Amino acid sequence: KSKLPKPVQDLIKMIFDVESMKKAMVEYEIDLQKMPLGKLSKRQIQAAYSILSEVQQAVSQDSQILDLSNRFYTLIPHDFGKPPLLNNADSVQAKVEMLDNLLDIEVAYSLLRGSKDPIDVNYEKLKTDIKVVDRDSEEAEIIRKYVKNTHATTHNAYDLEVIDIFKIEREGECQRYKPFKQLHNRRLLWHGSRTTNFAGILSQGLRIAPPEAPVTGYMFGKGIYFADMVSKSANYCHTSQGDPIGLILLGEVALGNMYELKHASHISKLPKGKHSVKGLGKTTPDPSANISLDGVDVPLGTGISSGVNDTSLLYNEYIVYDIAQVNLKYLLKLKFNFK
Ligand SMILES: NC(=O)c1cccc2cn(-c3ccc([C@@H]4CCCNC4)cc3)nc12
């Protein structure tokens, strides 16, 4: 019998939910006999990204493309009960999205399958210390206020309800973050992801897309993205009426000198002296309402006009291009109340 608090036990069950992993594979139309969870590999996913990149290169420049489309389905077997040809941009992005999720699903399954309560054994595999933040604490009030105040006006499909607040420490992240611990402009920001990705995120941290993956769909190039508006990140949990509970991170991000951009720029190397990109939004949390939570700026102010009209973005976003610039601090379990 596990001594872990019930919210921690319930979080471990959510994270290693095989049913959720299989349902996702069914939704992606993956053939679960030819490609069961146990047969997914890192080398297979790496090669599939390369094929999707090759697919775009061939399309940009019909027999040549069909061979690439067929090599993709041979590597990742699907069950269509005819296979849709990988020619249009939406078809390629749908497959990249599938791989991005399969990558962490592979991590979750490999951990799980690789005398004690199963919940305890699987908790230890995450190599992450997880503690419940009390509802009556100063931290919980600051965090609830951050959720409350930064829900965007255009994101009106749902209301957000905080279920549990966890304080997290990934093993080895302290050591990895040490070169950036004293960098200026450290901010507490949101990062949403599908619930099926959290086993991978807790065990391996937030990661950058591999070079093999297509460059399309990355407004500021391959990096780790964050928002200062909870709903902007909460949209990336991909919660539905079917699964209305999502997970969202609060990470301390060492932004340093921000390369401030109003439009897309596929960053390969930042300008010298710049440590991050700030995508400028039209609406920003009121800077006069910034609070410090144990030395880190928490931009929990209600949204006001940023005074920037000539931008592609409604809300800010922040990108770092080195995995070491992130130190995960909190993990929230959120209820999405769909309207
Ligand atoms: N995940 C977040 O909380 C987040 C916050 C703010 C801006 C963000 C932008 N992203 C983002 C998420 C996904 C992607 C691509 C989309 C197409 C498939 N490959 C990944 C590019 C950017 N994630 C963000």
Author numbering: 662 to 722, 726 to 745, 748 to 780, 786 to 1010
Sentences from the paper on this structure:
Poly(ADP-ribosyl) polymerases (PARPs) are a subgroup of four enzymes (PARP1, PARP2, PARP5a, and PARP5b; PARP5a and PARP5b are also known as tankyrase1 [TNKS1] and tankyrase2 [TNKS2], respectively) that continue the reaction (PARylation) to generate long chains of linear and branched poly-ADP-ribose (PAR) on target proteins. We determined crystal structures of the catalytic domain of PARP1 and the ART domain of TNKS1 in the absence and the presence of the ligands.
PARP1–niraparib structure is similar to the previously reported cocrystal structure. Inhibitors stack on Tyr907 in PARP1 and make conserved hydrogen bonding interactions with backbone nitrogen and carbonyl oxygen of Gly863 and the sidechain hydroxyl of Ser904. The basic nitrogen of the piperidine ring of niraparib makes a hydrogen bonding interaction with Glu766 from the helical domain of PARP1. Thus, compounds with basic groups oriented toward the helical domain would show selectivity for PARP1 as we see in the case of niraparib and veliparib. Niraparib selectivity can be explained based on its conformational energetics as well as the electrostatic effect, whereas veliparib's overtly basic nature might be responsible for its selectivity for PARP1.
